[PDB]
Amino acid sequence: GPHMATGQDRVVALVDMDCFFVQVEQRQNPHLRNKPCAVVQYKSWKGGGIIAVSYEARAFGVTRSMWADDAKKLCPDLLLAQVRESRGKANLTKYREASVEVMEIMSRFAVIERASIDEAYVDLTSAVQERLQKLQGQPISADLLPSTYIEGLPQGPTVQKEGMRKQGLFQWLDSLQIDNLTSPDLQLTVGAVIVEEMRAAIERETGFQCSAGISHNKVLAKLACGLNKPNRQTLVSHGSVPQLFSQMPIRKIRSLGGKLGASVIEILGIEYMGELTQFTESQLQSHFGEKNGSWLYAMCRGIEHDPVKPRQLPKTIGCSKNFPGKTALATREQVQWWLLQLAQELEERLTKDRNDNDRVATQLVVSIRVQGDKRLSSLRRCCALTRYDAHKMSHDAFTVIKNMNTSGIQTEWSPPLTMLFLCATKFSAS
DNA sequence: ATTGCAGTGCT
DNA sequence: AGCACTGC
Ligand SMILES: Nc1ncnc2c1ncn2[C@H]1C[C@H](O)[C@@H](COP(=O)(O)NP(=O)(O)OP(=O)(O)O)O1
Ligand SMILES: [Mg+2]
Ligand SMILES: [Mg+2]
- What b/e sequence results for A41-70 when a residue is b if at least 16 CB atoms lie within 10 Å of its CB, and e otherwise? beeeeebbbbbbbbebbbebebeeebebee
A413, A404 contact by CB (below 8 A): no
CA A338 to chain CA mean position, Å: 29
- The CATH architecture of the domain made up of A19-88 is 3-Layer(aba) Sandwich (3.40)
Q: Does domain A308-430 have CATH number 1.10.1200.10?
A: no
Describe chain A by its helix, strand, coil percentages, rounded to 5. Answer: 45, 20, 35
Q: Is A393 annotated as a binding residue?
A: no
Q: Is A235 helix (H, G, I), strand (E, B) or coil?
A: strand
* Gap from A291 CA to B3 C1', Å: 33
Q: How many Å apart are CA A41 and CA A199, to the nearest integer? A: 29
Q: Would you say the C-beta of A266 is within 7 Å of strand C?
A: no
Q: Is A119 annotated as a binding residue?
A: yes
For residue A49, report the distance from its CA to the centre of ligand 1, in Å: 13
| Ligand number, closest to the Cα atom of A232 | 1
Q: Is A108 annotated as a binding residue?
A: no
Determine the protein residue whose CA lies at the shortest distance from the C1' of B6. A116
Q: How many Å apart are CA A53 and CA A56, to the nearest integer? A: 8
* Gap from A125 CA to B6 C1', Å: 27
Q: Would you say the C-beta of A289 is within 7 Å of strand B?
A: yes
* Gap from A174 CA to B7 C1', Å: 41
Q: How many Å apart are CA A308 and CA A300, to the nearest integer? A: 20
Q: How many Å apart are CA A181 and CA A191, to the nearest integer? A: 13
DSSP letter string over A137-148? SPPPPGGG-TTE
Whole-number Cα distances in Å, A425 to A63, A100, A254: 33, 19, 26
For residue A264, report the distance from its CA to the centre of ligand 2, in Å: 25
Element (H, E) at A83: none
Q: Is A256 helix (H, G, I), strand (E, B) or coil?
A: coil
- What b/e sequence results for A127-138 when a residue is b if at least 16 CB atoms lie within 10 Å of its CB, and e otherwise? bbeebbeeeeee
Determine the protein residue whose CA lies at the shortest distance from the C1' of C4. A375
Cβ atoms within 10 Å, residue A26:
22
Q: Is-cis flag, bond preceding A230, omega within 30? A: yes
Q: Would you say the C-beta of A118 is within 7 Å of strand C?
A: yes
Q: Would you say the C-beta of A258 is within 7 Å of strand C?
A: yes
Residue A320: exposed, middle, or buried by beta-carbon count in 10 A (0-12, 13-18, 19+)?
Answer: middle
DSSP letter string over A161-219? HHHHHHHHHHHHHHT--TT-TT-HHHHHHHHHHHHHHHHHHHHHHH---EEEEEESSHH
H and E: helices and strands count for chain A? 14, 16
A149, A232 contact by CB (below 8 A): yes
Put residue A334 in one of left, alpha, beta given phi > 0 → left and psi -120 to 50 → alpha: alpha
- Top-tier CATH class for A250-307: mainly alpha
Q: Where are the domains of chain A?
A: 1-18+89-249, 19-88, 250-307, 308-430
* Gap from A158 CA to C8 C1', Å: 37
Breaks (C-N over 2.5 A) in chain A follow: 157
Handedness of CA A57, A61, A66, A68 (dihedral sign): negative
Whole-number Cα distances in Å, A408 to A339, A414, A415: 22, 9, 11
Residue A90, φ and ψ in degrees, nearest 5:
-60, 145
Residue A251, φ and ψ in degrees, nearest 5:
-65, -15
Q: Is A17 annotated as a binding residue?
A: yes
Whole-number Cα distances in Å, A357 to A113, A384, A429: 16, 21, 9
Whole-number Cα distances in Å, A59 to A53, A62, A69, A128: 10, 7, 17, 38
Per CATH, the number for A1-18+89-249 is 3.30.70.270
Q: How many Å apart are CA A57 and CA A253, to the nearest integer? A: 26
A230, A237 contact by CB (below 8 A): no
Residue A187, φ and ψ in degrees, nearest 5:
-60, -40
Q: How many Å apart are CA A33 and CA A30, to the nearest integer? A: 5
A282, A385 contact by CB (below 8 A): no
CA A213 to chain CA mean position, Å: 13
Q: How many Å apart are CA A127 and CA A191, to the nearest integer? A: 8
Amino acid in position A77: D
**Pocket perturbation via mutation, ligand 1, pick of A19, A83, A103 by most ligand atoms within 8 A of CB:** A19
Element (H, E) at A282: helix A281-288
For residue A211, report the distance from its CA to the centre of ligand 3, in Å: 8
Which residues, including other chains, have CB under 8 Å from residue A248's CB and lie 6 or more apart?
Answer: A223, A272, A273, A274
Residue count (chain A): 430
Comparing CA positions, the residue from A300, A280, A296, A347 lying closest to residue A319 is A347
Residue A176, φ and ψ in degrees, nearest 5:
-80, 135
H-type helices in A207-280, by residue range? 218-225, 241-246, 259-268
Amino acid in position A402: K
Which residues, including other chains, have CB under 8 Å from residue A113's CB and lie 6 or more apart?
Answer: A120, A121, A308, A309, A310, A311, A312
Pairing between strand A89-90 and A85-86? antiparallel
A413, A353 contact by CB (below 8 A): no
- Ligand 1, residues at Cβ distance < 6 Å: A 16-21, 51-52, 64, 117-118, 229-230
Residue nearest to atom 1 of ligand 1 (CA): A51
A43, A85 contact by CB (below 8 A): no
H-type helices in A300-424, by residue range? 332-357, 390-401
Q: Is A252 helix (H, G, I), strand (E, B) or coil?
A: helix
Which nucleotides in chain B lie less than 7 Å from some protein C-beta? 1-10
For residue A204, report the distance from its CA to the centre of ligand 3, in Å: 18
DSSP letter string over A317-351? EEEEEE--GGG-EEEHHHHHHHHHHHHHHHHHHHH
Pairing between strand A210-215 and A233-235? parallel
Comparing CA positions, the residue from A425, A368, A377, A376 lying closest to residue A400 is A368
Q: Strand locations in A36-169, DSSP E?
A: 37-41, 49-53, 79-82, 85-86, 89-90, 112-116, 119-123, 148-150
Handedness of CA A328, A333, A336, A342 (dihedral sign): negative
Q: What angle do CA A167, A235, A151 make, to 5 degrees?
A: 50
Handedness of CA A308, A312, A315, A318 (dihedral sign): positive
Q: Would you say the C-beta of A116 is within 7 Å of strand C?
A: yes
Indicate which technique resolved this structure: X-ray
Whole-number Cα distances in Å, A294 to A79, A218, A308, A358: 48, 16, 19, 39
Q: How many Å apart are CA A95 and CA A93, to the nearest integer? A: 5
Q: What is the resolution of this structure in A?
A: 1.8
